[PDB]
Every structure is written in C-alpha cells, then in structure tokens.
C-alpha cells in the first residue's frame, strides 16, 4: 500500500478530525462534511492552471470516494482517518438515535451521497462551469472502485507516472532517475 497525497488533500474540518465528538448528526456532521467545501482547492489554487480542467475535477472524484471510505473502512491506519474516532463519531451519533441506521447501512455516502459533491468549492474559487457528463462523478455512482486498494493505485499512473513519462520524452541520468 502506497498512500497518495490523500493525507493532506483531505481537508476535514477541525471538529470531525479532532477529539471532540459531534453534538447532532443532523446539524454538525451534516454541516461539517459540507464544511469541507474547502475540498475545492484543486482548481481553486493548485489545478487552476497546472493541468487541464478535466483533471482537477478528476482529482475530486478521488477525494469523494476517499471521503466515502473514511466513513466506512478505508486503509489509512491513523487515529484521525482509520482506526480513528471520526468513524466512531458517526456510529456514536446514529447509535444515539436508537440505532436508526448503521453508518454502513445508510448515510454511507449513499443516502446523502450527493452532499454538494464539492462542486461548490470547485465553483467557489475556480469558477469553471462543470460539464453535465463531468457532474456525475463528483456525486454518487454505483462503482466503488474497489476499496481504495486499486483506485489510489488508479491515481498513481494518472499523474505520478505519466508526467515523468512525458518528461522522459521531453540529463540521461536524470531520465534514468525515474
């Protein structure tokens, strides 16, 4: 397992990531997960001109599924993201609601999978119109891309290998340093 920069590109609010539990899921986890409209700095700051417009939104697709698997069984091994209490923040609050629904039963980024789809953050700073075909990946789609074991791997070659490839196609020791 090679963790991509999901360690930082995930910009959870302080409340969920911190030790403090949440008062009510209908209002704080509600408003805090959307509180990560700050998950819109790809085209806001970094991908604004670094790459083509499509890839910036493709990176959001990666965060969304990442976000989904934080809520239920990712593979980060960290007290704030996996083996963490934020997943318990969900279970604790729903269980407080007479076990109304498991976090992996509903509210698994399925019942309210839509959120804002981070497009508000995309639009907040980048201010680039999302194509209708581009607007269905930041929201829910049936494929889960297999538990992050082969999606974060999906993202490795999308940039971390192909851009070094095109650099090579563009000293030879530095080329052989890839």
């Amino acid at each position: 397992v090679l963790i991509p920069p999901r360690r930082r590109q995930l910009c959870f609010s302080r409340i969920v990531r911190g030790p403090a539990n949440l008062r009510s899921l209908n209002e704080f986890k509600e408003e805090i997960l959307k509180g990560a409209q700050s998950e819109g700095k790809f085209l806001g700051n970094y991908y604004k001109e670094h790459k083509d417009k499509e890839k910036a939104l493709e990176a959001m697709k990666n965060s969304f599924y990442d976000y989904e698997d934080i809520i239920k069984g990712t593979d980060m091994l960290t007290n704030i993201e996996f083996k963490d209490i934020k997943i318990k923040l969900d279970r604790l609050l729903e269980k407080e609601t007479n076990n109304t629904k498991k976090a992996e039963d509903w509210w698994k980024t399925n019942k309210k999978s839509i959120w804002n789809a981070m497009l508000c953050g995309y639009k907040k700073s980048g201010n680039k119109i999302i194509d209708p075909s581009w607007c269905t990946i930041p929201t829910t789609e049936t494929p889960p891309q297999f538990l992050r074991w082969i999606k974060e791997w999906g993202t490795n070659v999308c940039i971390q290998k192909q851009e070094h490839k095109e650099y090579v196609k563009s000293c030879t020791s530095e080329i052989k340093k890839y």
Binding site: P19, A20, N21, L22, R23, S24, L92
Partner: protein, 224 residues
C-alpha cells in the same frame, strides 16, 4: 425473631413530606396471621398499617408497617416501640427506635464544581457535581433543579455520606448530574438544593451556570 425497625431517614422526611416507618424483621416461622403495630410511651392509639409483604420463601420473612407520626414528636426524639405479634411467638416483638441525640448540628457547605474542561472539550457530556461537605448528621438529601424545574432522581446519583478525612465529626457527600454538552453551553443555571437539619431553613441552594467561574479575560483600561 427480632424486628429491625428503620427510622424515617431525612431523605424520606423531605422527599415525601411525611414520616413513614417500617418494621423489617428477621423471622423464623415464615407466615403468621397477625400483622404489625406501633406503640408509643404515651400509649396513643396505633396507626393503620397496610400492604404487608408476602411470605419470604427462605424463611427470613420481612414485614412492613406504615405509620403516620408527627414531625415534632419525632423531632423531640421520644422513643417509638414497634409491637409485632405472631401466632408462633405470643410475646410481642417490642423493639424501639429513636433518632440519635447528642450529635452537634453542622451546616453543610455546598460547592457546585463545574465540569472539567477536559470533559466539555469532548462535547459529549458535562457531569456537574454538588460537593456537600461539613455536615455532622449523617443524613442528607441532595436534589437537582435544572432551569427552575426539579429533575427526576434518574438523572443524578448522590453518593452516600462518608466521614470527612480531616474533620472526624463532620461528613461529606457527592451528587453528580450529567447533561449533554449541548445543554451545558446554553447556560441553564443548574441548581443544587441540599436538605439538611442544620441549615437555617433546612435547604440551601447553589447554582452553577456556563458563565460562572469565567475570569475577566479582557481588561480594557481606557485612560484619556
């Protein structure tokens, strides 16, 4: 067979507003027809006792006899004798209980410690504790009123009185009330009322609010 009559605890006196008594007993013969009775040195008429407990299978039958007694008469400490007669034992089980005298009355000091910030930081609970210390009679009755409405005994748990470490005669007690941190931040003025004999009016209040205990962070000194 000897009856273990219990005096009406101050908690019973103040919670029910009436002096209710019972005559629990260690018993040899499980069941007998005749029931409980209460007698006084004055020899006044016995009070009605009802709802006697059913036969105890393990032969340690315990019976309850309820009587109404004037608070002043019990306050004076005059001895009351429980008289229980049974078919097996013709001799009445004459046993007397009176509130102990000769103990100095010491006024409780009630100090309402707010929740530890280590707890409010979790934003999951806020255990307010009513620290009752310094009262000499063992009896005490702590009750919690939130926002002016009394709260059911379920919400709060009152620790049994125990001897104070430093002062031997005096006692202390605890009463923690747990409320979700959402309620605490609203500032609902959770008040603790302690009922004790030594108090001037038998009850004193101490109210803790989210604001209380906050020092003056900002000290603006505008001088022209």
């Amino acid at each position: 067979i000897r009856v273990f009559a219990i005096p009406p605890s101050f908690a019973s006196i103040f919670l029910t507003k009436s002096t209710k008594l019972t005559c629990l007993v260690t018993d040899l013969t499980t069941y007998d027809s005749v029931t409980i009775s209460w007698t006084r040195q004055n020899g006044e008429a016995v009070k009605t006792h009802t709802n006697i407990s059913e036969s105890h299978p393990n032969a340690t039958f315990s019976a309850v006899g309820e009587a109404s007694i004037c608070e002043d008469d019990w306050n004076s400490g005059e001895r009351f004798t429980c008289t229980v007669t049974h078919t097996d034992l013709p001799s009445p089980l004459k046993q007397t209980i009176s509130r102990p005298k000769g103990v100095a009355l010491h006024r409780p000091d009630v100090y309402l410690l707010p929740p530890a910030r280590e707890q409010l930081n979790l934003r999951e609970s806020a255990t307010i504790t009513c620290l009752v210390t310094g009262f000499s009679p063992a009896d005490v009755f702590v009750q919690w009123m939130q926002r002016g409405q009394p709260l059911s005994p379920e919400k709060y748990v009152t620790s049994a009185p125990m001897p104070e470490p430093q002062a031997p005669g005096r006692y202390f007690a605890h009463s923690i009330l747990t409320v979700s941190e959402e309620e605490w931040n609203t500032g609902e003025t959770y008040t603790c009322v302690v009922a004790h004999e030594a108090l001037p009016n038998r009850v004193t209040e101490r109210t803790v609010d989210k604001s209380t205990g906050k020092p003056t962070l900002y000290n603006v000194s505008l001088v022209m």
